[PDB]
Amino acid sequence: MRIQVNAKGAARLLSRHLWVFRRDVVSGPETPGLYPVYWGRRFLALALYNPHTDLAVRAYRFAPAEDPVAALLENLAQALARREAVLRQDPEGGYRLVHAEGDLLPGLVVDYYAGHAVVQATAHAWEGLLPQVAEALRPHVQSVLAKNDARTRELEGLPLYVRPLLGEVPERVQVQEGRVRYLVDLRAGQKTGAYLDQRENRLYMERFRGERALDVFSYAGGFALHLALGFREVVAVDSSAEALRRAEENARLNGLGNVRVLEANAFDLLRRLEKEGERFDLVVLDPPAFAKGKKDVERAYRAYKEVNLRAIKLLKEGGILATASCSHHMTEPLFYAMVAEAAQDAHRLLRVVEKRGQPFDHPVLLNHPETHYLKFAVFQVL
C-alpha cells in the first residue's frame, strides 16, 4: 500500500520537513499504520499515517526499508543509545529518552525520572508497539508507565488511559538535579512537576550569587531551588496555588527556607514592585507560551516586551536577567529583537552572558522549525 502526496507535499518531504497535512495527500491506505510515501512513482519517505487526521503524514525515514516496523524500532534503539551514557553516569537524574520528531520518532515521547520512565504515544501506529517500547527501555529502568491521557490522542482515535507497562510504578520519585532534588508526581491527577526542557538552564543558574532574586512564572519552583543556593532571598511568583504548593514542598525537601512563594499575576506584580522601589540582583522570566498560533505573534511580542521591560527596570547594576520563551512562533530572531527593544527602552546596557535553548535530550531539527520552541538567554546589566 502507498501514500500519494501532491507537489506541495513532495516539496515538503524533499526539503526534509517531516509533516504533510491531509489536504496534500492525494490518496492513501484505509487504516492508520506505517507506509511508504510517493510523489507519482518517486519514493520520498516512510511515515506514520492516519487517514482521519489533519496531520496525516509524519515521516521517520527518507530511504526505503523492507520492514517499516523494524525500521521504526531501529530509530527507537538509536534514540535510546544517545542517552545511554548519561543514564549510567547520572541514574537519579531526569532526562527525556525520546523526543518525537526530533528523534525521528514522531508521535512518541519517553521521559526518565530517576529510573522510572513515562511513555506518551500520540500517533496511532505506536499503540500496538508499546510492548516493544517497554522492552527496549527495560535495560535502563525500574518501571515504565503508559501515560496516554493527552487530549491529542483523541484526534488519532485513540483511547485515553494511564496504566503501568513494566514493573512497579511509584506515586512519587525524587530526582537529583545538580545540587538540589525535586519530587516528581507520577499519579494521573497530579502535576508531574519536572519540566525537563529547562533542566540545563536551571543548572546554569547555580553560578550566580547575590542578595535578592525574583523567579517570575515559577511553576514548580525549579529555577528558585537553584537560585536559593546562591541568593539570600528568592521570591517565587506564580498564579497557580497548586504549582506553588509543589514549589514549597521541593524547597522543604532541600531545606531551603530562603525561598518564599507569592501567589499573584506576574504582570501586575512586576509593575507594582517597581512602583514601590523594590530592586533585585537577578530576575528569571520563564513564562508559559504567550503565542499559541501564528496569528498571536504581534500581540505576544508586545506582552513579552512589557514583562521584559519591567524585569530589566527592577535590576541593579551588575544584575542578571535570565529570560525565555517557549512559543515556537516567537522565533529566535523575534525573541532577541524583543529583548533588545526592552533593554533600549529601559536605558540599560546588557552584556550577553549566554544564549541557550533546548538541551541535548530535546533535539531540534533544522529542517523542521516546529521542533525548535525554547529560547533561553542570560544577560548582565552594565
- Residues serving a catalytic function are 326
Select from K ion, a copy of itself, none the partner in contact with residue 355, using the beta carbon and a kind-dependent cut-off of 5 to 8 Å: a copy of itself
Select from K ion, a copy of itself, none the partner in contact with residue 7, using the beta carbon and a kind-dependent cut-off of 5 to 8 Å: none
- Rounded Cα–Cα distance for residues 139 and 131 (Å): 14
Select from K ion, a copy of itself, none the partner in contact with residue 212, using the beta carbon and a kind-dependent cut-off of 5 to 8 Å: none
Does 148 bind K ion (CB under 5 A)? Our answer is no
Q: Which residue has the cell 530535546?
A: 362
Q: Which is nearer to a copy of itself, 40 or 288 (CB)?
A: 40
143 among the known binding-site residues?
no
Q: Which residue has the cell 530509530?
A: 75
Q: Which is nearer to a copy of itself, 241 or 366 (CB)?
A: 366
Radius of gyration of the chain from its Cα atoms, rounded to whole angstroms: 22
Select from K ion, a copy of itself, none the partner in contact with residue 382, using the beta carbon and a kind-dependent cut-off of 5 to 8 Å: a copy of itself
- Rounded Cα–Cα distance for residues 88 and 321 (Å): 34
Piece of 84-92, 233-241, 243-251, 356-364 that binds a copy of itself (CB under 8 A): 356-364
Pick the closest to residue 193 from 118, 247, 114 (CA basis). Answer: 247
- Rounded Cα–Cα distance for residues 123 and 156 (Å): 6
- Rounded Cα–Cα distance for residues 282 and 305 (Å): 18
- Rounded Cα–Cα distance for residues 62 and 64 (Å): 7
- At 252 the three-state DSSP class reads helix
Instruction: Identify the residue among 32, 33, 102, 287 touching a copy of itself (CB under 8 A).
Output: 102
Smallest distance, Å, CB 103 to a copy of itself?
9
- Rounded Cα–Cα distance for residues 210 and 208 (Å): 7
Q: Which is nearer to a copy of itself, 287 or 357 (CB)?
A: 357
Q: Which residue has the cell 499503540?
A: 127
- At 320 the three-state DSSP class reads strand
- Rounded Cα–Cα distance for residues 252 and 151 (Å): 33
Piece of 11-19, 115-123, 174-182, 246-254 that binds a copy of itself (CB under 8 A): 11-19
- Rounded Cα–Cα distance for residues 159 and 187 (Å): 18
259, 226 Cβ separation under 8 angstroms: no
81, 49 Cβ separation under 8 angstroms: no
Does 336 bind a copy of itself (CB under 8 A)? Our answer is yes
Residues between 160 and 199 with contacts to K ion, criterion CB under 5 A: 185, 190, 192
Q: Which residue has the cell 501532491?
A: 6
Q: Which residue has the cell 548519561?
A: 86
Does 267 bind a copy of itself (CB under 8 A)? Our answer is no
Does 221 bind a copy of itself (CB under 8 A)? Our answer is no
Q: Which is nearer to a copy of itself, 161 or 360 (CB)?
A: 360
Smallest distance, Å, CB 184 to K ion?
8
Select from K ion, a copy of itself, none the partner in contact with residue 192, using the beta carbon and a kind-dependent cut-off of 5 to 8 Å: K ion
218 among the known binding-site residues?
no
Cell numbers found for residue 134: 517497554
Q: Which is nearer to a copy of itself, 28 or 363 (CB)?
A: 363
Instruction: Identify the residue among 1, 7, 14, 70 touching a copy of itself (CB under 8 A).
Output: 14
Provide the binding-site residues for K ion, judged by CB under 5 A.
185, 190, 192
User: What residue numbers does the annotated binding site for S-adenosyl-L-homocysteine cover?
Assistant: 202, 217, 238-239, 265-266, 286
Provide the binding-site residues for a copy of itself, judged by CB under 8 A.
14-16, 62, 102, 104, 332-333, 336, 339-340, 343-345, 347-352, 355, 357, 363-368, 372, 379, 382
